[PDB]
Motif scaffolding. Structure first.
Motif, PDB file in Angstrom:
ATOM      1  N   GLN A   1      69.326  46.472  40.958  1.00 58.52           N
ATOM      2  CA  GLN A   1      68.905  47.564  41.609  1.00 58.52           C
ATOM      3  C   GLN A   1      68.040  48.381  40.888  1.00 58.52           C
ATOM      4  O   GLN A   1      66.887  48.863  41.366  1.00 58.52           O
ATOM      5  N   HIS A   2      68.398  48.944  39.833  1.00 61.71           N
ATOM      6  CA  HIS A   2      67.670  49.669  38.791  1.00 61.71           C
ATOM      7  C   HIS A   2      66.321  49.108  38.513  1.00 61.71           C
ATOM      8  O   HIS A   2      65.517  49.873  38.642  1.00 61.71           O
ATOM      9  N   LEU A   3      66.397  47.710  38.415  1.00 61.83           N
ATOM     10  CA  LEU A   3      65.211  47.060  37.990  1.00 61.83           C
ATOM     11  C   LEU A   3      63.970  46.930  39.114  1.00 61.83           C
ATOM     12  O   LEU A   3      63.038  47.013  39.031  1.00 61.83           O
ATOM     13  N   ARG A   4      64.608  46.709  40.328  1.00 63.79           N
ATOM     14  CA  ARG A   4      63.744  46.554  41.457  1.00 63.79           C
ATOM     15  C   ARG A   4      63.305  47.970  41.823  1.00 63.79           C
ATOM     16  O   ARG A   4      62.048  48.079  42.093  1.00 63.79           O
ATOM     17  N   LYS A   5      63.919  49.168  41.608  1.00 67.67           N
ATOM     18  CA  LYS A   5      63.319  50.714  41.730  1.00 67.67           C
ATOM     19  C   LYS A   5      62.175  50.795  40.675  1.00 67.67           C
ATOM     20  O   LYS A   5      61.021  51.276  41.106  1.00 67.67           O
ATOM     21  N   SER A   6      62.237  50.117  39.445  1.00 67.87           N
ATOM     22  CA  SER A   6      61.065  50.208  38.430  1.00 67.87           C
ATOM     23  C   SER A   6      59.912  49.560  38.768  1.00 67.87           C
ATOM     24  O   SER A   6      58.813  50.086  38.703  1.00 67.87           O
ATOM     25  N   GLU A   7      60.409  48.329  39.449  1.00 67.66           N
ATOM     26  CA  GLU A   7      59.171  47.625  39.813  1.00 67.66           C
ATOM     27  C   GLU A   7      58.487  48.027  41.116  1.00 67.66           C
ATOM     28  O   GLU A   7      57.215  47.832  41.059  1.00 67.66           O
ATOM     29  N   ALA A   8      59.177  48.778  42.069  1.00 65.78           N
ATOM     30  CA  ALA A   8      58.502  49.361  43.333  1.00 65.78           C
ATOM     31  C   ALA A   8      57.496  50.535  42.507  1.00 65.78           C
ATOM     32  O   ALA A   8      56.269  50.550  42.903  1.00 65.78           O
ATOM     33  N   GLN A   9      58.109  51.096  41.693  1.00 62.85           N
ATOM     34  CA  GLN A   9      57.351  52.346  40.977  1.00 62.85           C
ATOM     35  C   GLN A   9      55.888  51.601  40.449  1.00 62.85           C
ATOM     36  O   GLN A   9      54.760  52.137  40.681  1.00 62.85           O
ATOM     37  N   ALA A  10      55.897  50.564  39.439  1.00 60.65           N
ATOM     38  CA  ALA A  10      55.005  49.884  38.878  1.00 60.65           C
ATOM     39  C   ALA A  10      53.860  49.468  40.071  1.00 60.65           C
ATOM     40  O   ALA A  10      52.730  49.448  39.885  1.00 60.65           O
ATOM     41  N   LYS A  11      54.493  48.822  41.083  1.00 63.24           N
ATOM     42  CA  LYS A  11      53.651  48.422  42.444  1.00 63.24           C
ATOM     43  C   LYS A  11      52.764  49.547  42.754  1.00 63.24           C
ATOM     44  O   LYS A  11      51.509  49.332  42.843  1.00 63.24           O
ATOM     45  N   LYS A  12      53.394  50.539  42.958  1.00 64.16           N
ATOM     46  CA  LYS A  12      52.875  51.902  43.960  1.00 64.16           C
ATOM     47  C   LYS A  12      51.883  52.242  42.863  1.00 64.16           C
ATOM     48  O   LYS A  12      50.707  53.059  43.148  1.00 64.16           O
ATOM     49  N   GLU A  13      51.951  52.502  41.544  1.00 67.18           N
ATOM     50  CA  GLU A  13      50.974  52.929  40.468  1.00 67.18           C
ATOM     51  C   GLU A  13      49.845  51.801  40.260  1.00 67.18           C
ATOM     52  O   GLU A  13      49.114  52.263  39.369  1.00 67.18           O
ATOM     53  N   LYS A  14      49.848  50.409  40.820  1.00 67.37           N
ATOM     54  CA  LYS A  14      49.177  49.443  40.575  1.00 67.37           C
ATOM     55  C   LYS A  14      48.874  49.155  39.173  1.00 67.37           C
ATOM     56  O   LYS A  14      47.660  49.112  38.469  1.00 67.37           O
ATOM     57  N   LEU A  15      49.927  49.000  38.321  1.00 66.51           N
ATOM     58  CA  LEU A  15      50.066  48.904  37.040  1.00 66.51           C
ATOM     59  C   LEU A  15      49.778  47.380  36.560  1.00 66.51           C
ATOM     60  O   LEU A  15      50.621  46.534  36.901  1.00 66.51           O
ATOM     61  N   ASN A  16      48.892  47.006  35.927  1.00 66.28           N
ATOM     62  CA  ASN A  16      48.637  45.602  35.060  1.00 66.28           C
ATOM     63  C   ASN A  16      48.903  44.664  36.106  1.00 66.28           C
ATOM     64  O   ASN A  16      47.715  44.324  36.836  1.00 66.28           O
ATOM     65  N   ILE A  17      49.959  43.925  36.204  1.00 65.14           N
ATOM     66  CA  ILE A  17      50.117  42.771  37.115  1.00 65.14           C
ATOM     67  C   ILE A  17      49.937  43.005  38.555  1.00 65.14           C
ATOM     68  O   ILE A  17      49.311  42.263  39.165  1.00 65.14           O
ATOM     69  N   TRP A  18      49.875  44.259  38.944  1.00 65.76           N
ATOM     70  CA  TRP A  18      49.884  44.807  40.034  1.00 65.76           C
ATOM     71  C   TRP A  18      48.487  45.469  40.520  1.00 65.76           C
ATOM     72  O   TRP A  18      48.514  45.996  41.337  1.00 65.76           O
ATOM     73  N   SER A  19      47.729  45.440  39.443  1.00 58.22           N
ATOM     74  CA  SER A  19      46.565  46.022  39.646  1.00 58.22           C
ATOM     75  C   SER A  19      45.373  44.911  40.269  1.00 58.22           C
ATOM     76  O   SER A  19      45.296  43.843  40.067  1.00 58.22           O
TER      77      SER A  19
END
Length: 136
Positions: free
Chosen positions: A118-136
């Protein structure tokens, strides 16, 4: 309840695989619950952000004061003989750090090795929202 134990660096191998001395023996560890793009992918070889993920893990692990491993509640090795752990560099979880920076996705999860899912899913959600790296 999980607990942290000490380990010593031998070699960073890839974004998601590191070799450590653990209880006096060299052992390869695979980071639980994350998938990084690979430089040593069995079929593809070198993927986008592969070198970046590998560099991030390398730097984080080589510059740490203290490395600890934390096994989950289930099997502690995979079929390839790799330890399945959460790895901490100076108290920060490498598995989370990778996901937070958009350099890993949360893996397919195999219960009961899913304590920090759950903790890691929360971090991934944040990375996606910020469009970082893989999510850009």
């Amino acid at each position: 309840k999980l607990h942290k134990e000490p380990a010593t660096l031998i070699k960073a191998i890839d974004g998601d695989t590191v070799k450590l001395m653990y209880k006096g023996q060299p052992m390869t560890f695979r980071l639980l619950l994350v998938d990084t793009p690979e430089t040593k992918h069995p079929k593809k070889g070198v993927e986008k952000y592969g070198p970046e993920a590998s560099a991030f893990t390398k730097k984080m692990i080589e510059n740490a004061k203290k490395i600890e491993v934390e096994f989950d509640k289930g099997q502690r090795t995979d079929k390839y003989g790799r330890g399945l752990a959460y790895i901490y560099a100076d108290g920060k979880m490498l598995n989370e750090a990778l996901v937070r920076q958009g350099l890993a996705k949360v893996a397919y999860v195999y219960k009961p090795n899913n304590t920090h899912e759950q903790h890691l899913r929360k971090s991934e959600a944040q990375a996606k929202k910020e469009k970082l790296n893989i999510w850009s």
